Amino acid sequence: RMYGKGKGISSSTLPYKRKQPSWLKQKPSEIEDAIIKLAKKGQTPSQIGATLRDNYGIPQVKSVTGNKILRILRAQGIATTIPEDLYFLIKKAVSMRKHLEKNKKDKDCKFRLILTESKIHRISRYYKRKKLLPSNWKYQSSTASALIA
Amino acid sequence: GSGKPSGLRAARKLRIRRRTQRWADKSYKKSHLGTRWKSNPFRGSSHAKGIVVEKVAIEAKQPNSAYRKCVRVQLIKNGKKITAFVPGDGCLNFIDENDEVLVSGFGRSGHSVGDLPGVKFKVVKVARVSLLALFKEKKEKPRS
């Protein structure tokens, strides 16, 4: 674990079978169409896959179609400009900063905000090392409130 | 781990750490601090010639009981006052009050030796005549 203690090994492990499940007679074209429609209606790719698994019964979209969900989302050109994890980290930091402004005596919230912004800076450094985030992107803490677009 | 970097490209840290830590033991500090020239009366010399100022008896430590016969020497190099132990049994009266004497270390570098407190030097010859050759047997000539 990045901060604090506790290994916490809880996770999800994919099955050995890498192919589409045999019972699934569904077609990749409508799978991608549904993913596009659902993203248009507006959800982050993680929860897109979540509702796809829960309500459409199509686990491991990579098995049904030979690529990843963010990959098709980008290929359609509608993927958001800020990755999911960075966006959620920014949102959390904005919320706790807003809370701190009213309650500046919350030393614990100050500490957690420092940790969150450290995570934001590390993650953004990685994302801009990749070409998928503009080089001048910095995340100054002032305009982050409206940075959520 | 081991407490030290083991990287193939971590020589700088190991070298810096050794360089800093070498200042911890007494031996290296003593032998590489420039203060020793300023401190010791010999300025790093093994021996030194000086002028006897006066003779003095010095108490031994508590477990022992003796009046060691030392002398006080004004060195010629710097005019520093030192105390030098006169070896031998009856050699104290065989040195004069203003005679020139050659003195050396007492065998433990800058440390006191034996029950004698604070004496780091011993005379080896007076009036260019060896105390050994002058006391152990009069095989050399007496005092000039």
Binding site: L14, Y16, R18 | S6, G7, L8
Partner: protein, 129 residues
Amino acid sequence: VRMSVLADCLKTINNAEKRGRRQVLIRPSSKVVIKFLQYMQKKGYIGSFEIVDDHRSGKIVVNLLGRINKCAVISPRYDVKLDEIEKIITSILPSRLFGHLILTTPYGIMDHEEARRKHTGGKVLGFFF
């Protein structure tokens, strides 16, 4: 952070052998550890090991003959010229009649003796005896 998978593999094998458990599971397999294991096998220090391939950088189960008494890695992988092979083996190996110091060389992974016999010492990997 696992850093070196080979170090963990060799430590696990050494511990299992000292326990005398005749069969040991090495979780993070790799081609380097596979080559090291089959060199140990060719020199006869272990039995027939078997790699189980999931889609997750699979595991290895190795049969122990209770016959190796110390296998270990050398970290960092110092680069060794052909000249000081004899300088390092008298420091590492218990004797020069047995024991093997494993090198990675431009012509593959091999021990000190055949590294001598075909020249071109390389980087050091580990040892076993």
